[PDB]
């Protein structure tokens, strides 16, 4: 039941590739849960290469009285964003999302409507983007029976012409084996496999192929937790890229993560990309 | 005094904005009352609440009580053989607050992010009137507030005293903050600033998050408290005068029987 959506389809492998290391960036997040319903998150990203300071304050209002969720975010470039989520209002698996962005300093507005239908094995989703440049409509439908799953994504724009962007993603998802192949307009061909040998060993393999210039690139990643608080991550790319990350829980909420990407050669040309991450949860 | 303004811009901006914010606040208060829903209360939790109230009342009012009965109460509560609080144990939920994290959370939560909805209203109001001059504030202001104050007028020589409609409505929001309670009462929920923030007396005062831990805490609090019979001092009234019973006895004649 509840088949995976298009964005979530394969998100395990990308998340393994994404989460774990943030070299070149400084991670600083604080999450706070209140007693009744209040959620507060303050995250701060610091860059040493570009010397940039980025951050967002995110306030979450979980209302189970009617299924309403109120989210308000604030960035550093004077951008204001509000979001309303309604789930299980009158239908079975209907979800309505309203996202709005407005700037007080200058004047700029953007709108986004998300709609989601979830059923026994049928997943429907429609995103309508309202902007001055041009409205766009994007629909993703996922169908599967037991383990065989296939999803279709389409993107259409009324501003220019009959532009249509096709996406066909076919995969096999089960308890410990997860394989997924994504096809973009018969041009992009991606294949991700992810498996778990034990409760401590995780392996992932990614392949990318194209029909235009016949470019092929593959990469493998391993994740292993020595202890419930100590974890290690390694990733190797096709050409020479190697990345190592190590995470350890220091205080019962405080965790420290270290990331290092090495690009070195033997012709006197080498480079290090380091990154520190630290978060607090309350 | 300069910049002679029209008499049509005061009757089409000031009064509309004032009535708009007044009725927005009133509507918010009424909708907050309407949306309020009761919380289900289970009998065991109710009984736990009443026992807590009984023990707290014993703690507060324990001087005007016989020592023997006070010790009987305290033994019944403590009772090392059986114990009411010791034996009676309900389900326990795994907690998550921690000393340093919660000590910090006391300030992290706060009410910092409760101004944005009013900023949205101000932004819409300012969007409606692009180039406008509502009023001037007598209070002298610094030129570094002019970008926030004017926000739509291309003038660098003009003073910052002349405000736009955005700051006009912003000051209008807190101007009636103490006026709303005048017509409603002490418990007013018409605050335009705190829209999402729930402000109420609070349904179901008693919140036994961990029944067992509260039981143990009250068990030790009742063991700590001493006994001092405040009745034992009766000699103060002994040597005194009785003139108040002469007091309204004079004023109890004047009323007849209906």
């Amino acid at each position: 039941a509840v088949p995976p959506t298009y964005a979530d389809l394969g998100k395990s492998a990308r998340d393994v590739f994404t989460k774990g290391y943030g070299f070149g960036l400084i991670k600083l997040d604080l999450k706070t849960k209140s007693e009744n319903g209040l959620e507060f998150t303050s995250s701060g990203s610091a860059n040493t290469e570009t010397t940039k300071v980025t951050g967002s304050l995110e306030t979450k209002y979980r209302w189970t009285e009617y299924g309403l969720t109120f989210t308000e975010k604030w960035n550093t470039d004077n951008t204001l964003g509000t979001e309303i989520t309604v789930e299980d209002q009158l239908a079975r698996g209907l979800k309505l999302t309203f996202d709005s962005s407005f700037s007080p300093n200058t004047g700029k507005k953007n709108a986004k409507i998300k709609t989601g239908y979830k059923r026994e094995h049928i997943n429907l989703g429609c995103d309508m983007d309202f902007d001055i440049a041009g409205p766009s409509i994007r629909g993703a439908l996922v169908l599967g029976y037991e383990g065989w799953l296939a999803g279709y994504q389409m993107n259409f724009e009324t501003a220019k012409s009959r532009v249509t962007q096709s996406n066909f993603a076919v995969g096999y998802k089960t308890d410990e084996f997860q394989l997924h192949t994504n096809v973009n307009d018969g041009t992009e061909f991606g294949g991700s496999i992810y498996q778990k040998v034990n409760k401590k060993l995780e392996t992932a393999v990614n392949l990318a192929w194209t029909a235009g210039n016949s470019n092929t690139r593959f990469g493998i990643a391993a994740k292993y937790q020595i202890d419930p608080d100590a974890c290690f991550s390694a990733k190797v790319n096709n050409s020479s890229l190697i990345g190592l990350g190590y995470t350890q829980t220091l205080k019962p909420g405080i965790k420290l993560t270290l990331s290092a990407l090495l690009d070195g050669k033997n012709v006197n040309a080498g480079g290090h990309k380091l990154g520190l991450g630290l978060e607090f949860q309350a | 005094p300069e910049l002679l303004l029209d008499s049509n811009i005061r009757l089409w901006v000031v009064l509309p904005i004032v009535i708009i914010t007044f009725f927005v606040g009133m509507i918010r208060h009424y909708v907050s009352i309407l949306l309020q829903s009761d919380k289900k209360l289970t009998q065991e939790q109710v009984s736990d609440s009443q026992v807590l109230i009984r023990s707290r009342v014993l703690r507060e009012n324990g001087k005007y009580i016989p020592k023997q009965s006070f010790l009987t109460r305290k033994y019944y509560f403590n009772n090392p053989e059986d114990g009411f609080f010791k034996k009676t144990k309900r389900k326990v939920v795994p907690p998550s607050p921690m000393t340093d994290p919660t000590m910090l959370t006391d300030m992290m939560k706060g009410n910092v992010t409760n101004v944005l909805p009013m900023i949205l209203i101000g932004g819409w109001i300012n969007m409606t009137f692009s180039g406008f001059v509502t009023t001037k504030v007598p209070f002298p202001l610094t030129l570094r507030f002019k970008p926030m104050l004017q926000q739509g007028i291309e003038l660098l020589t003009l003073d910052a005293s002349w405000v736009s409609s955005a700051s006009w409505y912003f000051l209008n929001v807190f101007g009636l903050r103490s006026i709303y309670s005048l017509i409603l009462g002490q418990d007013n929920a018409a605050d335009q600033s705190r829209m999402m923030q729930e402000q109420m007396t609070g349904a179901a005062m008693a919140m036994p998050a961990d029944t067992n831990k509260a039981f143990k805490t009250e068990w030790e609090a009742l063991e700590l408290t001493d006994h001092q019979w405040a009745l034992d001092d009766v000699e103060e009234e002994l040597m005194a005068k009785d003139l108040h019973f002469e007091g309204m006895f004079k004023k109890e004649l004047q009323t007849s029987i209906f």
Partner: peptide, 19 residues
């Protein structure tokens, strides 16, 4: 608009009631 979209949800919810 940030305000026009926050009214469309109540509008739809109130429309779905008589229907």
């Amino acid at each position: 608009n940030p305000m026009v979209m926050m009214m469309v949800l109540p509008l739809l919810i109130f429309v779905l009631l008589p229907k």
